[PDB]
């Protein structure tokens with residue numbers, strides 16, 4: 237029996253139902269843009285469960301026994317089986333508000349509120365936004381527009397590996413015992429990504445050393461002329477606080493734009509000779525490295541279902557920093573992701589199987 241939870245499903249990158257899931261992902265994204273959280277969640281769960289199937293849906297009979305497929309979702313699947321297209325997703329793709337929100341938020345520094353503001357001002361293209369003489373842009377948006385073409389082109393694995401080398405070389409200069417791990421989509425086996433994420437931890441660093449590393453590493457890159465953008469968020473995580481029932485609670489992290497020289501990239505394959513890359517660095521205390529790694533590996537849907545399963549099925553509270561057992565009234569310790577899964581009574585799901 238297919239579980240309703242992504243954390244009890246193996247979801248690999250061989251998606252046999254892209255025709256259905258691309259349409260469901262568009263409809264979910266539109267519901268996010270229309271602030272319809274409930275309809276958004278229903279489409280996300282349906283998309284997720286179809287991504288896990290080991291075969292393609294070719295008839296309505298194939299949907300029997302599959303959870304998270306409500307009547308609205310089954311009408312969409314029926315329409316795609318009919319003529320290979322979703323009329324509903326096609327109408328979203330042609331909607332003026334949807335087109336504008338996708339295009340405007342594709343800029344680094346532009347979220348829902350700024351995209352909505354620009355749309356209500358009558359803007360429809362990035363050229364008209366950038367050349368307007370009345371608009372005021374944040375420092376994040378300025379960087380987003382300046383490096384737009386590089387940031388909108390997919391980061392590939394040779395580029396992610398080139399970035400990993402840069403991160404490791406800079407980090408070990410200040411903390412030689414530090415462990416640097418590439419997380420996110422690339423850890424799940426993806427060929428491309430919009431950014432490259434890293435988790436940094438040190439078994440012997442002090443509380444102060446741990447706090448200063450991201451400042452030292454970014455100052456070093458600034459001196460090197462490689463830091464195109466930098467925003468460091470100080471940690472809000474507390475050693476003895478219960479896990480959330482929240483994006484306001486986090487480890488020390490930074491959102492960066494790095495200058496990646498093409499000479500550093502070892503690929504099979506001209507212009508300026510460098511590429512702007514979005515990089516996120518996360519620093520965590522050594523004892524919480526498994527919780528942080530699990531949280532930063534993703535996918536978004538796998539993380540949501542892990543936390544939901546922990547709460548509803550195990551009466552446990554899971555977060556990027558800890559796992560708390562409400563029945564035993566104790567925090568559960570873990571040195572690996574495997575130990576976290578075992579505490580939750582779940583079979584271990586490999587990172588490449590978390591593409592929910």
Ligand SMILES: O=C(/C=C(\O)C(=O)O)/C=C/c1cc(C(=O)c2cccc(F)c2)c[nH]1
Pocket residue numbers: 280284418419420421422423426428429430431432433434532533534535536537538591592
């Ligand atoms: O799959 C989803 C979302 C669904 O599950 C849903 O909305 O239902 C994307 C989640 C996601 C993206 C990332 C990255 O930041 C990332 C990407 C590439 C390389 C890299 F190093 C980091 C990690 N998790």
